[PDB]
């Protein structure tokens, strides 16, 4: 597995500053890098692809530079909308694996549904649907934030259902699946414990351009008490 670390891990500017923010993988991930912005109480989104690649609809004041195991995110100048916490991920392999990422303070979709309160033991069921594309032609992944915690990868399926893949926290546990006449993906989650708490997003992605994370579903809290 490949780590990323950032640095800062927070930091308050005013409008106006030049804002950089480093990254580094613990191995050499090429420029297969990708940025995500993600507001509170919000799914991540893309920024920028391939290291310095700017998103479609992303505003010119976000760059990103770097290759190997160095990396950097530039907001040129902050604006009062740009208050978020950002991720550095690499997408050279498989899985991602997510951390902490950097809190700055100053068509196609993925739904997600079935979250809710259940009792340690207990079993559930999240749903991903998928809208104006076909979910098979993709990997789906579920990744997880705890209150106050970080982003954690929990489970992927290949596209064509091919593999699955689970975080050792929950392998033996969880179940990542789909059913194609719903164009829809799953996590069934059995044994449930406290720390599975958390808000469930899923996403999709594969290999291809821009080979990252470029759809997030909006997320579905899953309480465990």
């Known amino acids: 597995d490949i780590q990323m670390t950032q640095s800062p891990s927070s930091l308050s500017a005013s409008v106006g500053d030049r804002v950089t923010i480093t990254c580094r993988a613990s191995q050499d991930v090429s420029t297969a890098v990708a940025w995500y912005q993600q507001k509170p109480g919000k799914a991540p989104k893309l920024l920028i692809y391939?290291?310095?690649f700017l998103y479609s609809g992303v505003p010119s004041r976000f760059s990103g530079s770097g290759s190997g195991t160095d990396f950097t995110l530039t907001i040129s100048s902050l604006q009062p909308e740009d208050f978020a916490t950002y991720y550095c991920?690499?997408?050279?392999?498989?899985?991602?694996?997510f951390g902490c990422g950097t809190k700055v303070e100053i068509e196609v979709q993925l739904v997600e549904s079935g979250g809710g309160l259940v009792q340690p033991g207990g079993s559930l069921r999240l749903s991903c649907a998928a809208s104006?594309?076909?979910?098979?032609?993709?990997?789906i992944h579920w990744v997880r934030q705890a209150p106050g915690k970080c982003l954690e990868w929990v489970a992927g399926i290949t596209p064509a259902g091919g593999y699955t893949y689970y975080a050792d926290s929950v392998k033996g546990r969880f179940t990542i699946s789909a059913d194609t006449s719903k164009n829809t993906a799953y996590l069934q989650m059995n044994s449930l414990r406290a720390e599975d708490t958390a808000v469930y997003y899923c996403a999709r992605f594969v290999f291809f351009l821009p080979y990252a994370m470029d759809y997030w579903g909006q997320g579905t809290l899953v309480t465990v008490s």
């Open positions: 991920q690499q997408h050279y392999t498989t899985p991602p694996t």
């Open positions: 104006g594309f076909t979910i098979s032609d993709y990997w």
């Open positions: 391939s290291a310095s």
